[PDB]
Amino acid sequence: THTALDRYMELADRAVRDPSALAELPTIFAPDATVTLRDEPVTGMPAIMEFYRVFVAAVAESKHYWTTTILEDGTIESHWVVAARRADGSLMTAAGVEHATVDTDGLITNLRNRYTRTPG
């Protein structure tokens, strides 16, 4: 599928290679969207772009796999996995589920993640 959450997942690995790919974020998130990956919310495009710049700077190379469903209420859910080499040379894996609220244009207004395998 190619929902905004799919487009977001696709971006993840691309932006690690090429961080200027993050200029695509306004085609994924509504402006004034809120994102909570672990514990802290980040709201609005400027803060969202900087949070993801910082995020992808800490990663040397990554690969994500995911599966996406649209729930009863129109919420989008994606189960995902990652493997990566961090910028410090350490290796990591993680796995989780992301839940997105979308607006009538299909862009994400609220993104939440819960880990089923914490990054390690």
Ligand X SMILES: CC(C)=CCC[C@@]1(C)Oc2ccc(C(=O)O)cc2C[C@@H]1O
| Residue ranges in contact with ligand X by CB under 6 A | 8, 11-12, 15, 37, 52, 55-56, 64, 80, 82, 94, 98, 113, 119
Distance of CA 6 to the CA centre of its chain: 9
The piece of 4-12, 30-38, 48-56, 80-88 that touches a copy of itself (CB under 8 A) is 80-88
Helices (H) and strands (E) in the chain, counts: 2, 6
**Is position 83 an interface residue for a copy of itself (rule: CB under 8 A)?**
yes
Q: How many CB atoms lie within 10 A of CB 80?
A: 19
What gap in Å lies between CA 80 and CA 107, rounded to an integer?
A: 19
The piece of 35-43, 50-58, 69-77, 85-93 that touches a copy of itself (CB under 8 A) is 85-93
Q: Select from a copy of itself, ligand X, none the partner in contact with residue 113, using the beta carbon and a kind-dependent cut-off of 5 to 8 Å.
A: ligand X
Q: Select from a copy of itself, ligand X, none the partner in contact with residue 85, using the beta carbon and a kind-dependent cut-off of 5 to 8 Å.
A: a copy of itself
Element (H, E) at 82: strand 76-86
What gap in Å lies between CA 74 and CA 27, rounded to an integer?
A: 19
